[PDB]
Amino acid sequence: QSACTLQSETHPPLTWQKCSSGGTCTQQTGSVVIDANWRWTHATNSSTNCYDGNTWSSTLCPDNETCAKNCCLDGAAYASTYGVTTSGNSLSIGFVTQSAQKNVGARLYLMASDTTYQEFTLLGNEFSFDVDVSQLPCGLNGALYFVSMDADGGVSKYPTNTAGAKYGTGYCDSQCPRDLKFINGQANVEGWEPSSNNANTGIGGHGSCCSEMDIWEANSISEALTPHPCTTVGQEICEGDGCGGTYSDNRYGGTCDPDGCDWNPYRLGNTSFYGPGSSFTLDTTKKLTVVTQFETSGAINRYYVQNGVTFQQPNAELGSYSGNELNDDYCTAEEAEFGGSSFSDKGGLTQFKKATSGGMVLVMSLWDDYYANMLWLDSTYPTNETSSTPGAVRGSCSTSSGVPAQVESQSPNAKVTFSNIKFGPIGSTGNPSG
Ligand SMILES: OC[C@H]1O[C@@H](O[C@H]2[C@H](O)[C@@H](O)[C@H](O)O[C@@H]2CO)[C@H](O)[C@@H](O)[C@@H]1O
Ligand SMILES: *[C@@H]1O[C@H](CO)[C@@H](O)[C@H](O)[C@H]1NC(C)=O
Ligand SMILES: *[C@@H]1O[C@H](CO)[C@@H](O)[C@H](O)[C@H]1NC(C)=O
Ligand SMILES: [Sm+3]
Ligand SMILES: [Sm+3]
Ligand SMILES: [Sm+3]
Ligand SMILES: [Sm+3]
Ligand SMILES: [Sm+3]
């Protein structure tokens, strides 16, 4: 696609900190951009939509190449249309925002400049942030994660995409998502089928795969930390049922691991660590700090801070594994106790190091789950298992929570607020800011 300026594109600002082993932290100026899919797509020369509800214009947009020549992405009104505001080092994202239409959720990327995403090399370093999940009920997911996207959004490889990172192009993740309207400089109309349960989406014939590190998927009830390796580390288009991922016949038939090796403390047996109120170690009615370290072995360490007290990730006994680090040993024990081989099939933590040792782009989003209602995160899943099944129970939510029309209409003011991002060498992010 190309870019149109009927609505100007101005990225909300957001400050973060770059920390140093020398004891100091230095303020960086970034901005956030919304993903291209949320944007208005219309004709280059006019105002006729190329896309509406969940179908494409037969006239403007009869194939993938032509439709890219005829269509463009416009600017976005972050606050009034998409419920996205920033203030200082803080970013809020609202759930349902009513304007001319009803917008649900947002996915945003941190930017280095007007035209380029900020690339973070995770391996050897740590990422810290603060989050308020108090306004996230059952069924929602305020996510902060990284993906192996190209810094320029695809522009230098696919010259039919002149819009680029400024308009949020280039997304990929380990689900090899096929709901994207534009992939690799072309549209995704060759093959489209509308969603039945969703007025606004559908599934195209192409998907966009890459490595994904889910630092934080959470609401007020449950949280999880999950790396997802792929056989090909960075962004890469896939075709149809062979994409794999959530909406293909065989979830496991693609290049990426859609399950991951997740660590959810409640799932592992600690039902009093994370939750609403002061009967939980971490009280999700209040702001908390989350620190994540990418050890050079490929292991991942986690600790939290709330109201000045530091808590390490809780210990887990899981098969033969005992500890509190997401390593090799834990991943292997998880497969053996909870089932699965997707994670080690696609290379395990070793293959995941190739992602973390190159650049990854920071993503922050809020979403609801048209496929499984977020039950995999905060409830019993699958829905007909009971706690005598290992790892079935992931949170205390009811088995009928999370249906998207339900929560869209009963908690439209849900919001997530992320703030105070700090990034630098291991052990540096507890340094004072400045
Ligand atoms: O694809 C939806 C969701 O699935 C998550 O993997 C689940 C998986 O759905 C289920 O088969 C298994 O029993 O539990 C895992 C781990 O929670 C995946 O982790 C999510 O990222 C994905 O969004
Ligand atoms: C859960 O976590 C806390 C904090 O680590 C710990 O003191 C407590 O014993 C844990 N409970 C269980 C049942 O593992
Ligand atoms: C839940 O239903 C699934 C259906 O696939 C079945 O395999 C599983 O054994 C059931 N578990 C219980 C405890 O009924
Ligand atoms: Sm391919
Ligand atoms: Sm360690
Ligand atoms: Sm080992
Ligand atoms: Sm066992
Ligand atoms: Sm195997």
UniProtKB/Swiss-Prot annotation:
EC number: 3.2.1.91
PTM annotation (Pyrrolidone carboxylic acid): residues: 1
GO molecular function: cellulose 1,4-beta-cellobiosidase activity; cellulose binding
Single biological process term from Gene Ontology: cellulose catabolic process
Not glycosylated (site feature) positions: 64
Keywords (A to Z) from UniProt: Carbohydrate metabolism, Cellulose degradation, Disulfide bond, Glycoprotein, Glycosidase, Hydrolase, Polysaccharide degradation, Pyrrolidone carboxylic acid, Secreted, Signal
Positions bearing carbohydrate: 45, 270, 384
Major place of residence: secreted
Disulfide bonds: 4-72, 19-25, 50-71, 61-67, 138-397, 172-210, 176-209, 230-256, 238-243, 261-331
Subcellular location: Secreted
Region span, Disordered: 384-434
Top EC category: hydrolase
Catalytic activity: Hydrolysis of (1->4)-beta-D-glucosidic linkages in cellulose and cellotetraose, releasing cellobiose from the non-reducing ends of the chains
Post-translational events: N-glycosylated. The catalytic core domain comprises three N-linked glycans which each consist of a single N-acetylglucosamine residue. O-glycosylated. Within the linker domain, all 8 threonines are variably glycosylated with between at least one, and up to three, mannose residues per site. All serines in this domain are at least partially glycosylated with a single mannose residue. O-glycosylation of the cellulase linker provides protection from proteolysis. Linker glycans also contribute to binding affinity of cellobiohydrolases to cellulose.
GO cellular component: extracellular region
Compositional bias ranges of the Polar residues kind: 384-420
Highest taxon above the source species: Eukaryota
Domain remarks: The enzyme consists of two functional domains, a catalytic core joined to a carbohydrate-binding domain (CBM) by a serine-, threonine-, and proline-rich, highly glycosylated linker sequence.
Similarity-based family: Belongs to the glycosyl hydrolase 7 (cellulase C) family.
Note: T.reesei produces two different exocellobiohydrolases. They are unique in that they can hydrolyze crystalline cellulose in the absence of endoglucanases.
Functional note: Exocellobiohydrolases (CBH) that catalyzes the hydrolysis of 1,4-beta-D-glucosidic bonds in cellulose to release the disaccharide cellobiose. The degradation of cellulose involves an interplay between different cellulolytic enzymes. Hydrolysis starts with endoglucanases (EGs), which cut internal beta-1,4-glucosidic bonds in cellulose to reduce the polymerization degree of the substrate and create new chain ends for exocellobiohydrolases (CBHs). The CBHs release the disaccharide cellobiose from the non-reducing end of the cellulose polymer chain.
Protein name: Exoglucanase 1
Natural source organism: Hypocrea jecorina (Trichoderma reesei)
Shown part of the complete sequence: 18 to 451 of 513
